[PDB]
Design a protein around this ligand. Structure first.
Ligand code: FDE
Length: 184
């Protein structure tokens, strides 16, 4: 189960974060660490599409090759904190699993600048038991975490040393499909 009420960035700039571009997960921390593999690839696009706040997600397990994309229209709880009922889609936006009740994640932007961010998520999916998952994001898939985002990790009373890097997994991303999925 999730246990954290993550605090959104003071002065969060929504239009900059939700600009239609891609964010790569470079490091992550699950508080129930067996919930996610030790090796992983994820990325997201975030933007407004025809007036609707959207995210598109990509997950890839570099060992098993399990792949999936998702799309959500985000609802606002407050500036920088969102709830997102998701649908599983192929890379072209064709629905594989429809939106339903009980399938949603919360999403809080704890820190962001133009190039890096720290988020918290809490996934709810059916009867699964999932925990708090923090992710360091960058606009450049290869960027080492800089001092601004690492300081934000400390300010959330977390230790960056505990985060697991995605950088040694040979992750390759389809940026084009993430951007187009925003419209779907
Ligand atoms: C490492 C990592 C990282 C991440 C990130 C993320 C973010 C930022 C967000 C998210 C979300 C999500 N996820 Fe995530 N992630 C991960 C992981 C994961 C996994 C393993 C899974 C599967 C689960 C189950 O089903 O059990 C997921 C999962 C997930 C999901 C679901 C999808 C479907 O369709 O089913 C979602 C919605 N993810 N995510």
């Amino acid at each position: 189960a999730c246990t954290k009420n993550a605090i959104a960035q003071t002065g969060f700039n929504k239009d900059k974060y939700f600009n239609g571009d891609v964010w790569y997960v470079t490091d992550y921390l699950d508080l129930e660490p067996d919930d996610v593999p030790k090796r992983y690839c994820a990325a997201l696009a975030a933007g407004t599409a025809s007036g609707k706040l959207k995210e598109a997600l990509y997950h890839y397990d570099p060992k098993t090759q399990d792949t999936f994309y998702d799309v959500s229209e985000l609802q606002v709880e407050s500036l920088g904190k969102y709830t997102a009922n998701f649908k599983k889609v192929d890379k072209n936006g064709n629905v594989k699993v429809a939106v339903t009740a009980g399938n949603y994640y919360t999403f809080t932007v704890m820190y962001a600048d133009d190039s890096s961010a720290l988020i918290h998520t809490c996934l709810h999916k059916g009867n699964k038991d999932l925990g708090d998952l923090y992710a360091v994001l960058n606009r450049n898939k290869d960027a080492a975490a800089g001092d601004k985002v690492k300081s934000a990790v400390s300010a959330a009373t977390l230790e960056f040393s505990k985060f697991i890097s995605t950088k040694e997994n040979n992750c390759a991303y389809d940026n084009d499909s993430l951007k187009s999925l925003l419209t779907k």
